[PDB]
Symmetry: none
């Protein structure tokens, strides 16, 4: 009975769906596990709609391809900590807002954030999110060879500290995938 | 494989005018005549991606050497990786028996006009007026004042450039079926 929405208290910051952060170095099969997940359950998951200051392009829909905002707005969002991550290139800003992640859950889907280590660390610094963290591992670094293998090593070391709620080692694709399902649907 | 016997067609025009609607009908009615050129990248293929269809995958050293050799219409870095569009990838669609469509904006039009060996044709899809475009976009339930404004002022820039005679053909989209008919007349001319 805390902070119940009412006619005089029109606010809806209660409990929502927990978003799921998925990370792991590339080359582990992670993209194959997600394609399968979205193939099998195509009405359950969604991705955050990014924001940008660039001009819309042909076929682009505001609120679906991009949330198209002004530079000033974007700058006020950066300063007020509204982005999980953001970038700037060729004079244009791009980013993912905390809000866009909650927006996904509003349709009834669970948000998946497929992001890297810096991404994981940022989501951790944001108490309003409440994410679950899944890391997809190779069976061994050695296995991963076919340089920027140090990128992989540091993600592997970050995972050792018990950052993620679950590590899935992908030495077998079918079992990896059933562990992905068991985790996501717990 | 043929040579470069069909001229690639650059189709541009303000965001929001219904160009993408026109292209969608076109590809549905003629699914065997047209193709999109395939960009190149140094990012590693994600396992379910096909070299030649999603990207031409290359290595950093190949990409750099293609850069020095002038092979790209355009290129840049996005996150860790090089991407670009090669001249060859546009001529590829012609060698396959099709016609390349390049769905791009004014800035892209200028940058293709500066590779005159492409021998591109330029089609411009125009709204009946800026104020008509405002009303069209207002009619969609998704656009904000900011998102409309960005398009309107870009519409202004593109109409003014079109006014200088830059395109081979201007089609004004105020009736979809009539616009679509001029589209076909132009492409199959």
């Amino acid at each position: 009975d805390y902070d119940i929405p009412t006619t005089e208290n029109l606010y809806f910051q209660g409990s929502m769906s927990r978003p799921i952060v998925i990370s792991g170095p590339s080359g582990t099969g992670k993209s194959t596990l997600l394609k399968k997940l979205f193939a099998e359950y195509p009405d359950s998951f969604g991705f955050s709609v990014p924001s940008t200051t660039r001009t819309p392009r042909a076929g682009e829909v505001n609120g679906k391809d991009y949330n198209f905002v002004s530079v000033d707005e974007f700058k006020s969002m950066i300063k007020n900590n509204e982005f999980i991550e953001w970038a700037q290139f060729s004079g244009n800003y791009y980013g993912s807002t905390v809000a866009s992640v909650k927006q996904v859950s509003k349709s009834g889907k669970t948000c998946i954030l497929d992001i890297d280590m810096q991404g994981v660390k940022s989501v951790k610094a944001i108490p309003e999110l409440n994410a679950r963290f899944l890391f997809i591992a190779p069976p061994s670094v050695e296995d991963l060879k076919k340089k920027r293998l140090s990128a992989a090593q540091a993600e592997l070391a970050y995972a050792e500290t018990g950052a993620h709620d679950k590590v899935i080692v992908n030495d077998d694709l079918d079992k990896a995938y059933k562990e992905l399902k068991d985790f996501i649907f717990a």
